[PDB]
């Protein structure tokens, strides 16, 4: 008891809608701001804090 | 990069009565010798709904692990039907084989298990209270799911 994914009339699902089909610049980073990579020290320091968080969880 | 890779799991004595033991032939490669133990465990998911109905059938230790390719046979007693919800008793669930080093699971193999009545009438009209002496457990051993996790060796 359910829905057929096929689907005569399934074509409705594959419609292109550019307004919904692209990213908006709001909340994104453009064109110059801090992208700086995670180094080594900070990486292990972060992996550290997480392995502990999932310990207490 | 990892010191142990599973080469195979052989599902043995399958299909079988619900109550018969699970029998697995596990083969793995060890690229760098392990000074401490590997802990392998077989987990029957009792109910899809919750992680709370999972039963650990058995657990074995292996080690030290020298380098090379190895096998051991892992057998375990079938799950205890008193802990399985009646809704889930019949039909599909999952059994899992898992391995652990220094406390961290680095691998999880899983198989779909089907619990089915071999009795045509029961298949038609199953009792509200499921009869586990009538259930056959067919593991689908053609579709293992091998899932790997990055862990810290040493």
């Amino acid at each position: 008891d359910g829905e057929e994914l096929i689907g005569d009339g399934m074509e409705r699902d594959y419609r292109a809608i550019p307004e919904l089909d692209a990213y908006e610049a709001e909340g994104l980073a453009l064109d110059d701001e801090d992208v700086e990579e995670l180094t080594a020290s900070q990486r292990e320091a972060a992996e550290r804090a997480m392995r502990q968080r999932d310990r207490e969880a | 990069m990892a010191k142990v890779s599973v080469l195979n799991v052989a599902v043995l004595e399958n299909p079988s009565p619900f109550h018969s033991p699970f029998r697995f032939e596990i083969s793995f490669e060890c690229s760098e010798a392990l000074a401490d133990d590997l802990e392998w465990k077989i987990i029957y998911v009792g109910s899809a709904e919750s992680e709370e109905f999972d039963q650990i059938l058995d657990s074995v230790l292996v080690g030290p692990v020298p380098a090379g390719r190895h096998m051991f046979v892992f057998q375990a007693d079938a799950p205890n039907p008193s802990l399985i919800p009646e809704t889930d008793a019949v039909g599909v669930t999952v059994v899992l084989i898992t391995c652990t080093y220094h406390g961290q699971e680095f691998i999880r193999v899983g198989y779909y298990v089907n619990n089915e009545y071999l009795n045509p009438e029961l298949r038609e009209n199953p009792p509200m209270k499921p009869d586990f002496s009538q259930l056959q457990r067919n593991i689908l051993a053609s579709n293992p799911r091998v899932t790997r996790f990055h862990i810290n060796w040493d």
Binding site: - | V92, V94, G110, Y112, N114
Partner: protein, 77 residues
């Protein structure tokens, strides 16, 4: 067409989820693309397992149990 989840609703979704962890976040557009590629793959993956689980209970209709089960075979706790 290869459409799965449409880019904008996904971006909006990520942004909302991220808001609980840290306030005033921006993402690189590549980061969103990656979460997207990841999510879509993870889900088609479960769906694949879902059809398989559903075929061995002998059903043509997948059910939330099949999804539940599929996450277990991968060990999501």
């Amino acid at each position: 067409t290869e459409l799965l989840i449409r880019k904008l609703p996904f971006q909006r979704l990520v942004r909302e989820i991220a808001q609980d962890f840290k306030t005033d976040l921006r993402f690189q557009s590549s980061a969103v693309m990656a979460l997207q590629e990841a999510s879509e793959a993870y889900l088609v993956g479960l769906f694949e397992d879902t059809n398989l689980c559903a075929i061995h209970a002998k059903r043509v209709t997948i059910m939330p149990k099949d999804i539940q089960l599929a996450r277990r075979i991968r060990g999501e706790r």
